[PDB]
């Protein structure tokens, strides 16, 4: 074992697991999911005495993993995962998922043209997850046409600015609980324009962080066995956090 030395001892045998998923979505204007995937990694931070043999178990039956490499120390086959981890922080596994992804937010855009002069836009977001969980760091980014003289917005939650240099309205919300709805309206004031070329309407995109794996993955157990030393599994202090963040998360209209 060239990844972990042999004299390692800790008063407090403790490990930390991070499940870090980025969830990607391309959604049609009429709500069809055009494309969706999740990339994830499990990072482990372990302060464990000796040369312990852990078994990592999750609900891979109950979700479907489409492939994934592991860390050198993983013993290859419920065909569950086995290893002696390096001390400190390392990447346990990396994975991909396409089936049965929880799409934490739903974006519902509504767009109305007022002659040649104004666009009326309403955008609704819906959080799709347990009410006890908060999403945070939410941005909705609404692209505006190149011939935009100015923008008025109203929204009850958050703050929104027109950012002319980037041709987008950006709406930010610090936190938002599962199973809710929020909306923004904007009046976009148009300059006159070359009648011929139509507006090539980029999607509305989102940023967010959520405290669960959007793939549905959960950690069931991480079992520690070091059989020379006089600690056992139930002496180990175990922590998990899940951090699901948006990758490319777009809704067309």
């Amino acid at each position: 074992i060239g990844w972990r030395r042999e004299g390692i001892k800790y008063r407090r045998n403790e490990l930390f697991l991070d499940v870090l998923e980025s969830v990607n979505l391309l959604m049609s204007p009429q709500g069809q999911v055009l494309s969706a995937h999740v990339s994830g990694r499990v990072v482990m931070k372990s302060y464990l005495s000796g040369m312990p043999e852990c078994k990592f178990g999750m609900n891979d039956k109950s979700i479907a993993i489409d492939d994934c490499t592991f860390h050198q120390c993983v013993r290859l086959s419920e065909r569950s995962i086995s290893f002696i981890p390096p001390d400190g922080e390392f990447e346990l596994m990396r994975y991909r998922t396409t089936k049965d992804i929880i799409l934490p937010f739903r974006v519902i855009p509504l767009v109305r043209e007022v002659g040649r002069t104004k666009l009326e836009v309403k955008v609704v977001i819906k959080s799709n997850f347990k009410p006890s969980l908060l999403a945070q760091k939410i941005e909705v980014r609404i692209p505006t046409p190149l011939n935009t003289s100015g923008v008025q917005v109203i929204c009850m939650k958050g703050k929104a600015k027109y950012k002319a240099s980037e041709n987008a309205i950006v709406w930010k919300i610090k936190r938002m609980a599962g199973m809710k709805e929020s909306q923004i309206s904007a009046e976009i004031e148009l300059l006159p324009t070359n009648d011929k070329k139509k507006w090539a309407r980029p999607p509305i995109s989102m940023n967010f962080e959520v405290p669960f794996a959007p793939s549905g993955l959960k950690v069931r157990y991480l079992k520690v066995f070091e059989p020379k030393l006089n600690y056992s599994d139930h002496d180990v202090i175990k922590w998990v956090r899940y951090i699901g963040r948006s990758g490319i998360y777009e809704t067309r209209c």
């Binding site: 760091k137 405290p211 950690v219 202090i237 922590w239």
Partner: peptide, 10 residues
């Protein structure tokens, strides 16, 4: 969103 939960569940 980035708080450690103690123990693993299912």
């Amino acid at each position: 969103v980035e708080d450690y939960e103690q123990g693993l569940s299912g």
